[PDB]
């Protein structure tokens, strides 16, 4: 009946750059328009690691099959895709050049290029995270690990002794609140001190380069800091991890405020992988400052270039870059983009809603739900101190969310509402 559109073409009437949230949109853009347009997708990496369940992963509450998903699956069968990165974007020409060189034209462009992980900002990090024994752990799995490597789970369990550092890189970085495992670790290391598994000649400090944990929600940052103390955890601000020596287990830090670097023995290091701005977005004059797209806060349309959009993490938005945010930014992009193909006005506005669980304990969580102005809704920091209510919501996310990300990329389950 309906036939797959061509990938061997010279221009399309929509072009999506990304598969994770750029693909869920296309599958939504079709069901919203009934296939009246031919849309192309061009991602860069083959696998989509589901970082929304990254802590239930490290607890082995989610199997590796439910955490690793191919990028093709997000895209529907009809829409053609190719795993080639766009070399440059010519917005004045309405065109997009890929790595191979095949110039592609467009009518509307949707950018979901996220924040690109740059393991090389931290020298020697990747080669220590790939080692199946070294105590260097990170926010994501390398692609050379096979189905039988479960090093990720050993971070909390194998912390018998020594100095442990949890390092947060410089904003903008991916995985703000969803990759903070320093409250479940404390609980599990509070037991290990009680029966002797974890020595008392050990120190754990949070090396945060940024001044605050959550830039766009004051209430969450205040709660995190207040709760970090009540536990007894120590934080070091304005310090960022700069190098890792895998032989002697030395970690070179630098306090950007004073520019004064230190070297410290580690025996358990975790880092939230550091990102890096892509230059083809700055040669094209789209990004603003930090490297994020200069888009409207309400409609998500680019300030200049009325026909370019942007969503997800690539977009410069005053909210927490979560997934449930993007669930609301594809509903908006797929509307306006279609209103712009019909000439009509852009009637869909983004409220700034973003919802990410924060795990306060081994089996408890609280939701960070907040709109554009940092203002939280009825769930913001509820049942934060644990209890039967937070216990259940933990199971509903750990045992029941990874089973859903298959549908999202299928199409069988759409957004929350
Ligand atoms: N906790 C973490 O460390 C982490 C890291 C990445 C993503 N995430 C989650 O994923 C959610 C969605 O992320 P996103 O959609 O904003 O970005 P993303 O991290 O999912 O990646 C964006 C997609 O665009 C592709 N891409 C990047 N550069 C490209 C280029 N030059 N050309 C073509 N394709 C390119 C990528 O391969 C990818 O398919 C985020 O809200 C976040 O919750 C978390």
Numbering used by the authors: 27 to 443
Provide passages from the article that reported this PDB entry.
Using masked refinements, the resolution of different regions reached 2.5–3.1 Å, allowing de novo modelling. The Fo-wing clamps around the c-ring, and is formed by a 55-kDa subunit ATPTT1. Its tertiary fold superposes well with that of human mitochondrial sulfide:quinone oxidoreductase, which uses flavin adenine dinucleotide (FAD) for its activity. However, in ATPTT1 the binding pocket formed by two Rossmann folds contains the co-factor nicotinamide adenine dinucleotide (NAD). The nicotinamide group of the NAD is in close proximity to Cys205, which could potentially be the active site of ATPTT1. The human sulfide:quinone oxidoreductase is an integral membrane protein, and ATPTT1 locates closely to the matrix leaflet of the crista membrane with several adjacent lipid-like density features resolved in the cryo-EM density map. Thus, ATPTT1 is positioned to encounter membrane-embedded electron-acceptors, such as CoQ, in a similar fashion as the human enzyme.
